[PDB]
């Protein structure tokens, strides 16, 4: 019933207004890139203008970068035509945040999304496994229902609880239709959601949310459903 679009979140005044009549999620800090505490060229042959004209893919599936899960930079053999800079160009799919029967807010496809399609970056604060643990107990002491945690690399856990983006409304499903993929962008590892199937317009977007220890009941609906979240 109550949905909103990506751009609803860029006005804090308007949003906190919609927050008070439950037509938008609880407020948080919207970010495009990741917060921290401190922290090599493509090899495809160029396409012509003749080949740009029929829309044939620049740095498509045969690209040494793409295949190592490393995004091109500005100085790539296809430059602007290069299609393997999806993170940097924020080439996100069309998604609305929706309200789910029992899961809190969720994410649905506003159009048909083909398989292996960049949905969004999971952005947030990047913590070392000390900070993260302090935070887990801080949040358990706060009795926060929801949990916005994810491992990135050894001693690097991304926490969207306070600061983050609409990727954090992605819900679990024991039979999902997206997966995480870890990508390098200027030698900084980044993590985005990518579709694993042909999600129809209107359908909820879901992944296999894996995490440590009150194990939460799972309402994914799916047949052959674990029954609880975790691992």
The residues that touch ligand 76O, with contacts defined as CB under 6 A, are 103-106, 122, 145-148, 150, 167-172, 209, 216, 218-220
63 binds, among ligand 76O, Zn ion, none (CB under 5 to 8 A by kind): Zn ion
Distance separating alpha carbons of residues 105 and 111, to the nearest angstrom: 19
Distance separating alpha carbons of residues 97 and 112, to the nearest angstrom: 16
130 alpha carbon, distance to own chain's centre: 24
Q: How far is the CB of 80 from ligand 76O (least distance, A)?
A: 31
Distance separating alpha carbons of residues 87 and 99, to the nearest angstrom: 27
Does 111 belong to an annotated binding site?
A: no
Does 165 belong to an annotated binding site?
A: no
Q: How far is the CB of 217 from ligand 76O (least distance, A)?
A: 6
72 binds, among Zn ion, ligand 76O, none (CB under 5 to 8 A by kind): Zn ion
Kindly provide the residue ranges of all beta strands, DSSP E only, lying in 144-187, ordered along the sequence.
149-153, 156-164, 171-172, 178-185
Residue 47 lies near Zn ion (rule: CB under 5 A): no
Distance separating alpha carbons of residues 155 and 147, to the nearest angstrom: 18
Residue 59 lies near Zn ion (rule: CB under 5 A): yes
- Can you read off the two tokens belonging to residue 137? 């107990």
48 alpha carbon, distance to own chain's centre: 33
Q: Residues 122-150, buried b or exposed e (16+ Cβ, 10 A)? A: bbbbbbeeebbeebbeebeeeeeeebbbb
Paired residues of 153 in beta bridges? 156
Distance separating alpha carbons of residues 153 and 111, to the nearest angstrom: 32
170 binds, among ligand 76O, Zn ion, none (CB under 5 to 8 A by kind): ligand 76O
Interactions with Zn ion, residue window 167-206 (CB under 5 A): 174
Does 225 belong to an annotated binding site?
A: yes
97 binds, among Zn ion, ligand 76O, none (CB under 5 to 8 A by kind): none
Task: Pick one of 4, 24, 47, 63: the residue that binds Zn ion (CB under 5 A).
Answer: 63
Paired residues of 3 in beta bridges? 98
3-state secondary structure of 166: helix
Residue 229 lies near Zn ion (rule: CB under 5 A): no
Q: How far is the CB of 209 from ligand 76O (least distance, A)?
A: 5
- Can you read off the two tokens belonging to residue 80? 């602007």
Residues within the annotated binding site for Zn(2+)? 42, 44, 59, 63, 72, 76, 82, 174, 218, 220, 225
Residues within the annotated binding site for S-adenosyl-L-methionine? 103-105, 146-148, 171-172, 216, 219
For binding to Zn ion (CB under 5 A), which residues are involved? 42, 44, 59, 63, 72, 76, 82, 84, 174, 218, 220, 225
Residues within the annotated binding site? 42, 44, 59, 63, 72, 76, 82, 103-105, 146-148, 171-172, 174, 216, 218-220, 225
């Amino acid at each position: 019933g109550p949905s909103c679009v990506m751009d609803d979140f860029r006005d804090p005044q308007r949003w906190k207004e919609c927050a008070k009549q439950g037509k938008m999620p609880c407020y948080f800090d919207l970010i495009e890139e990741n917060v921290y505490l401190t922290e090599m060229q493509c090899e495809c042959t160029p396409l012509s203008k003749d080949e740009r004209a029929q829309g044939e893919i620049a740095c498509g599936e045969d690209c040494l970068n793409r295949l190592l899960m490393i995004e091109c930079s500005s100085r790539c053999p296809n430059g602007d035509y290069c299609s393997n800079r999806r993170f940097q160009r924020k080439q996100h799919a069309d998604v609305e945040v929706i309200l789910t029967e029992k899961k809190g807010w969720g994410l649905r496809a506003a159009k048909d999304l083909p398989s292996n399609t960049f949905v969004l970056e999971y952005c947030g604060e990047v913590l070392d496994h000390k900070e993260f643990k302090a935070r887990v107990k801080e949040y358990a002491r706060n009795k926060n229902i929801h949990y916005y945690f994810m491992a990135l690399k050894n001693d690097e856990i991304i926490d969207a609880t306070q600061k983050g983006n609409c990727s954090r409304f992605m819900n679990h499903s024991c039979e999902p239709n997206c997966e995480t993929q870890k990508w390098t962008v200027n030698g900084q590892l980044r993590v985005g959601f990518f579709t694993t199937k042909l999600v129809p317009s209107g359908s909820e977007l879901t992944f296999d949310y894996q995490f440590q220890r009150e194990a939460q009941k799972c309402f994914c609906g799916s047949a052959n459903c674990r029954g609880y979240l975790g691992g």
